[PDB]
Amino acid sequence: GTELDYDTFCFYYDWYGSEAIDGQYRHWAHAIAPDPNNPGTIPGTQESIASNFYPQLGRYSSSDPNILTKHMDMFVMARTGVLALTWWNEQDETEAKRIGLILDAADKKKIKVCFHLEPYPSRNVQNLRENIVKLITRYGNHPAFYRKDGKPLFFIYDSYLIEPSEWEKLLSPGGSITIRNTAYDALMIGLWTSSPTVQRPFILNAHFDGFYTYFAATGFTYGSTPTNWVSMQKWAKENGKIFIPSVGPGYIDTRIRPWNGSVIRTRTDGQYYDAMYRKAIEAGVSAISITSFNEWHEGSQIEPAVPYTSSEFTYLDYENREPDYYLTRTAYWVGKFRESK
Ligand SMILES: OC[C@H]1O[C@H](O[C@@H]2[C@H](O)[C@@H](O)O[C@H](CO)[C@H]2O)[C@@H](O)[C@@H](O)[C@@H]1O
Ligand SMILES: OC[C@H]1O[C@H](O[C@H]2[C@@H](O)[C@H](O)[C@@H](CO)O[C@@H]2O)[C@@H](O)[C@@H](O)[C@@H]1O
């Protein structure tokens, strides 16, 4: 009843800084997005951070070993066995440092780490192959590196930005630059966004091993509408694909995207999280992803948050629930998922 689940993947962000470690409050300070249809910047002061909520751990650094210890203890409380790490191909010493610290901290608690491959500049199947080789070579022998039946696993955000004819070269067994049957073979999980008429042939022709949905906001896409999950799972099973639906506790991003209020999803003291997690389990899936551990900008985090009012903003909080409620409610749902496996 307390063991970690290694079919539960929680999306984790390593881009936060503090004065203590980095010399700068990175990401707590953030540009405000212009409306797609001179917006300014959130300064990352104690009073004004780039979130509608306020972390229990304050304006922390993702490179602070003491913060990382606490985060791994939170994963243990939630029973979430896999940390799905955002990866932007920064190619700098700070990226390399933080990945190594995260792997070391995870292994102390028997947590595993996989990579979430983001839409970095000029991403294409050739530099993706080179980067998959780099990550497996650098980190594949670390004891915390995740494998499922011998294979690493990668999530690919906004995979539709690359044509299926390009994906086939990397992911078909006959592809020109294939990883299949090589030392670098891996489970590749693409993003299902829109309707089945578009997504079914995309996923088949790209040769993905499976698909996920990402968005914590119900109805944002066809794929993030949970009443579609039973039929998506049936299609996955008939076609030998792994479906990993994404569940989250709520959504609100209006500090950084003030024009995006129609995407707000209220937490209702945990009832929103309960409804989404129940739908994933009832669909009969073999793996679940959680959006998110700590995407504070988008208000999808399960990490503990505290009440806070400053001279500049009155933050949202988890009241009438306690700061660790979303960790303990995740553990409840992991138990119900395991009962169904
Ligand atoms: O939310 C601000 C954040 O947006 C973009 O990153 C995305 C978000 O973190 C979220 O939607 O999840 C995506 C998948 O993990 C991720 O791409 C970036 O523009 C980022 O720079 C920005 O801070
Ligand atoms: O516009 C804000 C929005 O940006 C991102 O979503 C975009 C894209 O990445 C998604 O694939 C499609 C799905 O239809 O929607 C947008 O174009 C996300 O960061 C999202 O959370 C955010 O609200």
Q: Would you list the DSSP string of 123-179? A: --HHHHHHHHHHHHHHHTTSTTB--BTTB-EEEETTGGGS-HHHHHHHHSTT-TT--
DSSP string, 36-55: -----EEE--SS--SSSS-B
Cβ(118) to ligand 2 under 6 A?
no
Q: How far is the CA of 339 from the centre of ligand 1 (A)?
A: 33
For ligand 1, atom 7, the nearest C-alpha belongs to 118
Peptide bond into 292 cis (omega under 30): yes
Domain tally, the chain: 1
**Cβ of residue 317 lying under 6 Å from some atom of ligand 1:** no
What the block records as the tokens of 260 is 């995006």
Q: Residue 307 C-alpha to ligand 1 middle, in angstroms?
A: 25
Å from CA of 67 to ligand 1 middle? 22
Q: What is the DSSP string of 52-87?
A: SS-BTT-S--TT-HHHHHHHHHHHHHHTEEEEEEEE
Amino acid at 90: E
Domain that holds residue 59: 1-341
Q: What is the number of the ligand closest to the CA of 260?
A: 2
The 8-class DSSP code of residue 337 comes to H
Alpha-carbon distance of 332 to 321, in angstroms, equals: 15
Interatomic CA distance for residues 34 and 19, integer angstroms: 28
CA-wise closest residue to 224 among 176, 181, 262, 192:
192
Separation between Cα atoms, residue 100 and residue 125, nearest integer Å? 25
Q: Could you tell me if 176 and 129 are in contact, meaning their C-beta atoms sit under 8 angstroms apart? A: no
Decide if 285 contacts 338 (C-beta within 8 A).
no
Q: Measuring from atom 14 of ligand 1, which residue has the nearest CA?
A: 157
Q: For a ligand 2 pocket test, name from 30, 32, 120, 215 the mutation site with the most ligand atoms within 8 angstroms of its C-beta.
A: 215
The DSSP 8-state label assigned to residue 269 in this structure reads G
Joined tokens for residue 8: 């539960």
Start-to-end C-alpha separation, the chain: 14
Long-range contacts at 260-264 (CB < 8 A, ≥ 24 apart): 263/217, 263/220, 264/217
Q: Which residues contact 199 (CB under 8 A, 6 or more apart)?
A: 192, 193, 211, 222, 223
105 alpha carbon – ligand 2 mean position (Å): 31
Taking a C-beta distance cutoff of 8 angstroms, is the pair 262, 216 a contact? Answer: no
Approach to solving: X-ray
Angle at 46 between CA 44 and CA 50, to 5 degrees: 35
Among 127, 132, 124, which Cα is nearest to 155's?
132
Encoded tokens for 287: 């793996």
Q: How far apart are CA 41 and CA 33, in angstroms?
A: 9
DSSP state of 321: S
Report whether residue 263 contacts ligand 2, using a CB cutoff of 6 Å: yes
* Chain centroid offset of residue 30 CA: 20
User: Going by CA atoms, what residue is nearest to atom 10 of ligand 2?
Assistant: 158
Ligand nearest to the CA of residue 219, numbered in listed order: 2
**How many angstroms does the Cα of residue 195 sit away from the middle of ligand 2?**
16
Q: What is the CATH number of the domain that holds 100?
A: 3.20.20.80
> How wide is the angle at C-alpha 330 spanned by C-alphas 325 and 335, nearest 5°?
130
Expressed in angstroms and rounded, the spacing between residue 170 Cα and the centre of ligand 1 is: 25
Say how many C-beta atoms besides its own lie within 10 A of residue 21's C-beta: 20
Beta bridge partners of 116: 86, 155
The Cα 55–Cα 301 span in angstroms is 10
Q: Which residues of 134-154 are buried (b: 16+ CB within 10 A; e: fewer)?
A: ebbeebeeeebbbebeeebbb
The resolution of the experimental structure, rounded to one decimal in Å, is 1.1
| Cα of 21 from ligand 2 centre, angstroms | 31
